[PDB]
């Protein structure tokens, strides 16, 4: 509640750390102060995690294979290296898609080289070439191949670029090497960067010399939406109801064809800035396509984003946008009228990855709830600058929070709801605090658009007002 109270809490939880750990962790905990847009407000980010602290961050392979490249349907993504990384990441993310799995869609499947000791000792390039041959043999309808490096690949000095070039020339197939070794970087963010660079280097410019595709003044491309539970579809229906033509969709229900068609698009609508800002800037520099951010979390942010997007086109698009907003007003009005009294005045703490800790605040405050704490695992100072405006004054901000820090913060703040991932879900459910998964939407969703807002309101009421939370204490104990 008080800034001094939050600072005292930070200094109290930092006591148990050794001198170096305490010094490093001090720069990552802050108290929000709006109108401050810099790394000055005691918030440093994108740094090496402290060893032995039970963090939450992933690896570069998680950021590349599991986030950017995986959701592409008509493409086979081979986890080059030992079984493991590929197995734990199989069907872990709910990037929805439409296709016949195993025939022309492979998002759910797991392709790996299954490195043995001999592959570590003698390398795995010939094995990779043979693997590409077998992939072509058994999966004829794949429209491309991407290899995702794991830690041993970068450690043992395996040249996958040469193999990729040779096999792509031989089979006339798009073979994309990604050097997403897990030890690279500090978190998934470098994986995002490496995957974006691979997309630019091997896929984006494939149709630069081609002019067959017919353009239209209303051509937009959704980038950064990974269709978690159908989010991309829920946003695309709203965009197309406005009269726009969504040519490309990165990367949830996405194909390599629309990734190659993206350079022909008039406007690039970025949802996840953290993961796709590199490719957005490259496309703006090369093809001159402007890109703008948007937020479809909650009716307020949805309406604001739709009006801002329609502002970039002629008056007919804006009139259609107003028509769409008017059409969808009664539904979200009914949803908020039903669910706000059950959720009004409830405090929420969030710990998610790149930008969801700030993008979902609008939906929460549109239901009557206040976000009293937020933080990121791998976001850069740009994300913190953006979220400092969204967060309310004297609210806690945490970067790469450890288990002990988040446990103590939750113990002292005592929120009514926590929105985070699976690794802290059961920890907080044991504590007796309602928890919601903000990565997979607790296998519900979508949460984007007006339909997504309805589902989000239902889920928030369901978890927060569940009778089980009232039965955590045995009646014969006091």
């Amino acid at each position: 509640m008080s800034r001094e109270e939050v600072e005292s809490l930070i200094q109290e939880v930092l006591e148990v750390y050794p001198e170096k750990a305490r010094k490093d962790r001090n720069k990552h905990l802050a108290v929000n102060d709006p109108a401050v847009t810099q790394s000055k407000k005691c918030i440093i980010s994108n740094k090496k995690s402290q060893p032995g602290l039970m963090t939450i961050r992933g690896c570069a392979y998680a950021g590349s294979k599991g986030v950017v490249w995986g959701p592409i349907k008509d493409m086979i993504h081979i986890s080059h290296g030992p079984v493991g990384c590929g197995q734990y990441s199989r069907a872990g993310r709910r990037n929805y898609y439409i296709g016949t799995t195993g025939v022309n869609a492979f998002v759910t499947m797991n392709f790996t080289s299954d490195f043995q000791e001999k592959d570590i000792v003698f390398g795995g390039d010939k094995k990779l070439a043979k693997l590409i041959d077998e992939v072509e043999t058994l999966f004829p309808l794949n429209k491309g191949i991407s290899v995702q490096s794991e830690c041993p690949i970068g450690l043992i000095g395996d040249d996958i670029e040469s193999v990729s070039k040779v096999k792509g020339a031989e089979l006339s197939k798009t073979i994309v090497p990604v050097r997403c070794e897990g030890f690279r970087g500090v978190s998934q963010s470098l994986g995002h960067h490496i995957a974006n660079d691979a997309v630019r280097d091997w896929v984006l410019g494939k149709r630069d010399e081609d002019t067959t595709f017919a353009s239209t003044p209303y051509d937009v491309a959704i980038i950064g939406d990974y269709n978690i539970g159908g989010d991309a579809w829920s946003s695309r229906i709203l965009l197309e109801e406005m009269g726009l033509r969504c040519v490309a969709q990165w990367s949830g229900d996405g194909s390599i064809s629309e990734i190659e068609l993206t350079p022909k698009v008039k406007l690039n609508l970025v949802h996840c800035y953290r993961s796709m800002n590199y490719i957005s800037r490259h496309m703006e520099e090369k093809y001159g396509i402007p890109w703008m951010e948007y937020n479809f979390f909650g009716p307020t942010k949805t309406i604001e984003s739709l009006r801002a997007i329609a502002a970039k086109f002629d008056e007919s698009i804006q009139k259609k946008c107003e028509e769409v907003i008017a059409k969808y007003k009664p539904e979200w009005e009914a949803v908020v009228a039903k669910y706000r009294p059950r959720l009004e005045g409830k405090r929420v703490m969030l710990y998610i990855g790149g930008l969801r800790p700030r993008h979902v605040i609008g939906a929460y405050e549109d239901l009557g709830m206040e976000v009293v704490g937020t933080g990121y695992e791998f976001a850069h100072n740009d994300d913190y600058d953006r979220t400092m405006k969204e967060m309310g004054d004297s609210t806690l901000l945490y970067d790469d929070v450890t288990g002990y820090e988040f446990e103590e913060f939750v113990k002292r703040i005592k929120p009514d709801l926590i929105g985070s991932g699976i690794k802290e879900k059961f920890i907080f459910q044991k504590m007796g605090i309602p928890f919601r998964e903000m990565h997979s939407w607790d296998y519900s969703g979508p949460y984007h658009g007006f339909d997504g807002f309805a589902i989000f309101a239902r889920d928030m009421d369901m978890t927060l007002n569940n009778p089980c939370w009232k039965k955590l204490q045995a009646p014969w104990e006091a």
């Binding site: 750390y17 032995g52 058994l138 629309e258």
Partner: protein, 522 residues
Amino acid sequence: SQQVDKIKASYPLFLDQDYKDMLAKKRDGFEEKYPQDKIDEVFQWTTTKEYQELNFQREALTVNPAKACQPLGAVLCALGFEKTMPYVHGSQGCVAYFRSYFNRHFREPVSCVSDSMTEDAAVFGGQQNMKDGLQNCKATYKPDMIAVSTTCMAEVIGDDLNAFINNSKKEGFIPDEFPVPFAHTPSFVGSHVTGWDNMFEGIARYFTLKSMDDKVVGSNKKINIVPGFETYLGNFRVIKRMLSEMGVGYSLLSDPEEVLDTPADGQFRMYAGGTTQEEMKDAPNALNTVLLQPWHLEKTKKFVEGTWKHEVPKLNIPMGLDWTDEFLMKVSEISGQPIPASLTKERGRLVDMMTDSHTWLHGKRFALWGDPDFVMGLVKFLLELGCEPVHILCHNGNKRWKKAVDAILAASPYGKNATVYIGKDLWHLRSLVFTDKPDFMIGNSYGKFIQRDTLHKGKEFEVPLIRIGFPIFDRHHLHRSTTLGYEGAMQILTTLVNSILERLDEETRGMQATDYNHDLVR
């Protein structure tokens, strides 16, 4: 559009006509996908025997494997010990994946730390990483013990765990008497069960190798029980219950049952009951050591025989009637305790259920996969039930295990059509269930996709999945079940017979078409 009275999640919201039209427009406009005729033709091709031969000619490509890497099992074994923190020397992404996997299977908190090694650690070797990580872990989480496993990244660069831990102790990063057992768990060798074996051998060697002088076999009148990689809490519970019923003093080493089943009472416990250091130290004084899963406890068996001088019995996993009886007989022989009447009554009741359900169980065809000991025990129990295990798949098997399973199948008339496959993945099994259709397939959640594929061929080709194994992700609280002992045999038998009965009921639910066989009594 949405109705507030009936809110629709993704299913069936995206089945609405507007969403259908939008998706069709997207597909026909920009996805450039093959015509549905080509897709159907290729799918039909994938279900044939030519595609099966091409699939089984694979040598470099693995598609949908069924196994994990060693540090996962190492982490589970470390969790089996009291107030012990699992510490994986290497990259943090591996630890994040391990924790996510175990959280999804168990729906419980899983504690594990990493030293977060990076490019500079890859160049110079992660020694300072280990020092700072051990200091930070012991300061922040205050464990009684830290059990150290390795990530493949640390295995490739050849980090010396022993020297690193010794140097951390010399430079005062951790106290000298603080227990830091370690194990090398290369991810490119073996699988998760191998990691469990390596971690247990490391812990036992840490606590017993230097104190071997004053140990006398059989002094404490106990039997050491080493379970192995186990993800069913009911298995720990049933072993403990049967051994307490027999009046036998036991020591269950690496018992993670309490930490993986902590109560929800407003308090979070990082550590629950486990194998204490006193039991680990007094283990060489036991009468004997019994390995519940001997086919992935080879290194542990070698260490226990060589160092503790225990005559480890040649016992199979106590799954099903015959092997549970053999296990109980061996335990009675070792400990001198007669088998009580309660266990005899339990066995009789299991035989009673067997005779009751034999009519529906007989002649059924099963394609099963999983870990070596679990797969072998399931095959034995299916043979005892008069079932035919047509396809047997074990990705992390070896030649000797295949020989043992082949000898088991030969000794029975119901294994005549059986075929064991080792080193094969679930795409191979998809081909097998397409070309030689079994009645059911038994395995973890990853088989559900196979079922989907079969149903796409036709309703008469669908092979239902029975979820017994690890990991189970799409069903809740199945990890509390039992597979060992007569209790586990009863649970497995009930699951199999009731799955058969649900399939029969569903196939006969059509009125005026097949409802003549929709019998009330079955």
